[PDB]
Amino acid sequence: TIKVTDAHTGKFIGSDSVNDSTLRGVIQGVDVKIDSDVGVSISWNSTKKTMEFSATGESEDIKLHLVDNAMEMQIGANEGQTILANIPQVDTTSLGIDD
C-alpha cells in the first residue's frame, strides 16, 4: 500500500495497492520500482523448525526529485509557434527483459 503526497504543502495526490511492487499510472509519465526487502522482520522457530516473516510496525519515507528537461523547436518567425518533441527512454530495464 503506497501513498504519495507533496513535499512542501501536503496535498494528497494518490494511493495504490499493488502486488508486484510497481507503482504505475498515478504520477504522470513515470513508473516507480521499489525493492522487495523494505521493512520486513525475519525470525526463526526452532520448536516448529520454520522461518516466519512479520511487519515492522513503522512507516518508511523516501523522497523523490524530478525535473522536466521537453524538446522545443522554433518553426516560425514569431512567438508561440514552437514544436514539442520527446524521446522515451529505452534499455533492458524499460523493455522488461532484464531478468
Partner: protein
Amino acid sequence: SEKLRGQISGLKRASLNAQDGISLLQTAEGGLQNIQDMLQRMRELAVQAGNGVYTTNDRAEIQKEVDQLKEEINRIASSTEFNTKKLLNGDSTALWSSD
C-alpha cells in the same frame, strides 16, 4: 518595407531550422533499427531451446551468448550521441534523482 524585410529574414531562418531539426530524428531511427534487428535473433535463440534432448550444460552455453548479446544491446542503448546530447538514454524528456 521594414516589416516585410524582417519577416523575410525570419522565414529563411526557420527554413534552415527545420532541417537542423530533422537530422536528429534520422539518427534516432537508425539506432532503433539496429536494436530491433538484434532482438529477433535473441528471440530465435530463445525459441530454439525447449526441445528436450539437450543436457543441462549446453543450455548454460546458450545463456552465455544471450547475456553477451544483452550487454551489447545495453551498450548500443547507452552509446548514441549527437552534438554532446545523448538521445535514447532518457536525457531528452525528464531528469530524476532520489536519496
